[PDB]
Design a protein around this ligand. Structure first.
Ligand SMILES: CN1C(=O)c2ccccc2NC(=O)[C@@H]1Cc1ccccc1
Ligand SMILES: CN1C(=O)c2ccccc2NC(=O)[C@@H]1Cc1ccccc1
Ligand SMILES: O=C(O)CCC(=O)C(=O)O
Ligand SMILES: O=C(O)CCC(=O)C(=O)O
Ligand code: NI
Ligand code: NI
Lengths: 288, 288
């Protein structure tokens, strides 16, 4: 059966979104450089090691869906310099997102998370994202343009044996989900820095870790229209960190007003006709 | 033709949402007491007088849709004690909203605004709300439960001659909008404190001010599911003001995490499995 289309981030930039819209998935080879992956991993390392189980009883908002052998750490801007600078300002990410969301308007990060799966982590059930946070998305018309997309960036090797992601190609256009079976999937085999890009309608799942030794890690970046509420908050991020970012990165983290694509757009998160950034006199690119 | 159903806030509380869902509109008599209206008006008075035209060239996010004889002031929590305490904690408002949005989950304020229309303000064109800020809503299925509702609270008398709101009853279920005509409307005649409640699909418009002397004022409260981004931001509201509010009011203004109605909800605006309010140790009901 047909494999997931593979595209260069360097040469095939304009082909990436059209490919995903047609097939429901694409692999962006070298989405992040090996340098950025190294720094990213180094910076988040301790935070994933201290992370408790998804549904730990200490948590206000426990995640009862993810397996107990999953560690997910979000709100990465205060943790990681590589994330807040390099990936939040990724030229490739921003071309794809503007390609994807131009019908709606501004987009932002719904969640940037590092996921690490312990050895022998079981396969996830096949699913579409967004159904445990945004019930609204299920009420969208079948042909409505995708309101969110997910970059699953490999931070270690994705192999068949260590639980590389499964996708069902074309499943983003499925209405009837009775064809849903692991029999219909193909794998996202990836080197560190490659990204699997899917939509909120692409049926997919984490793979079974079968070696019993390897630890698979990924950076999942759910980008979505600014009209939908993020899964994570950057409200508690220190102001010196926010003010070190570019204006674009600030907007992505909810530290700016937003705009819809409506011809006479009246805006989102505004303050009596003025933006957040003006009202709070928020500075940008102030180094730490 | 059939007039807008009128309901008591005291006796008919459970009938209000069912009435709106059937007819697209209802008048809630004495939604706010005359005392609350007085305090509200007194507190916002100067802020509406200093408010420039909707599309003033000083503005970052000008509103090019509203007439030049309209003054709209939003982000009312820092301006008005009556708003932040009395209306944000309105028992009637919260019963109606939980009735309306239970399929989706938590709801919050998309915009709380005082609108004041100058004498001889023209009638607005018939419209549905949300189309200049949330293009996503037009892509919802026809029978999807309303994702936002609008309380248009009279802060002065609404009469036929001074531009009382027009609605088309049943128009919230319309797909074909060729029957749209001022011929099909009825008026929301209201005393101060009464509220016209409509959905995001109800076709309506501000009326023509024909006396040339009267100034009509209203408080419009767009309540919507927490999965949709507010039109206004409370990010710049002083922390002592936020900490004076109830936990419920804090959530309504985006100063708390939110929950969807999904059985294993994973939450909105969370921080590594914990809420905003915990992470920032946000206090509540600390008087000023
Ligand atoms: C539940 N869930 C997450 O927690 C998650 C994690 C990372 C990025 C996106 C994301 N969004 C989701 O909707 C998923 C869906 C899911 C996960 C496992 C098993 C079944 C369904
Ligand atoms: C544009 N517009 C607002 O500005 C507005 C004002 C108050 C509360 C809600 C609200 N939302 C809206 O979508 C309206 C829609 C509109 C207004 C006038 C003429 C045509 C359409
Ligand atoms: O583990 C993976 O590769 C996919 C994870 C995923 O799809 C999810 O958690 O939503
Ligand atoms: O003026 C009114 O009564 C209605 C105003 C309105 O519908 C709007 O501005 O969206
Ligand atoms: Ni997933
Ligand atoms: Ni309106």
């Amino acid at each position: 059966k047909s494999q997931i289309p593979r595209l260069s981030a360097i040469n095939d930039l304009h082909k990436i979104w059209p490919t995903v819209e047609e097939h429901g998935a694409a692999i962006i080879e070298s989405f992040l450089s090996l340098d950025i992956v190294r720094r990213l991993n180094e910076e988040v390392d301790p935070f994933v090691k201290i992370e408790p189980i998804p549904a730990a009883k200490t948590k206000d908002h426990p995640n009862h869906v993810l397996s107990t052998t999953t560690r997910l750490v979000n709100v990465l801007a205060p943790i990681s310099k590589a994330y807040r600078e390099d990936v939040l300002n990724s030229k490739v990410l921003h071309r794809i997102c503007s390609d994807a969301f131009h019908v709606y308007g501004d987009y932002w990060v719904l969640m940037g998370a590092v996921m690490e799966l312990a050895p022998s982590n079981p396969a996830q059930p096949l699913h579409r994202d967004m159904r445990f946070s945004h019930p609204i998305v299920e009420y969208l018309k079948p042909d409505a343009p995708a309101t969110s997309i997910n970059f699953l960036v490999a931070l270690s090797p994705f192999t068949a044996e260590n639980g590389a992601t499964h996708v069902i190609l074309g499943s983003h256009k499925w209405q009837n989900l009775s064809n849903v079976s692991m029999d219909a999937t193909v794998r996202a085999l990836m080197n560190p820095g490659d990204a699997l890009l899917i939509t909120d309608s692409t049926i997919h799942c984490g793979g079974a870790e079968t070696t019993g030794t390897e630890t698979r890690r990924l950076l999942t970046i759910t980008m979505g229209i600014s009209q939908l509420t993020p899964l994570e908050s950057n409200l508690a991020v220190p102001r010196p960190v926010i003010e070190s970012l570019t204006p674009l990165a600030q907007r992505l983290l909810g530290w700016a007003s937003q705009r819809s694509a409506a011809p006479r757009d009246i805006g989102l998160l505004t303050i009596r006709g003025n933006s957040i950034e003006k009202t709070m006199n928020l500075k940008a690119e102030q180094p730490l």
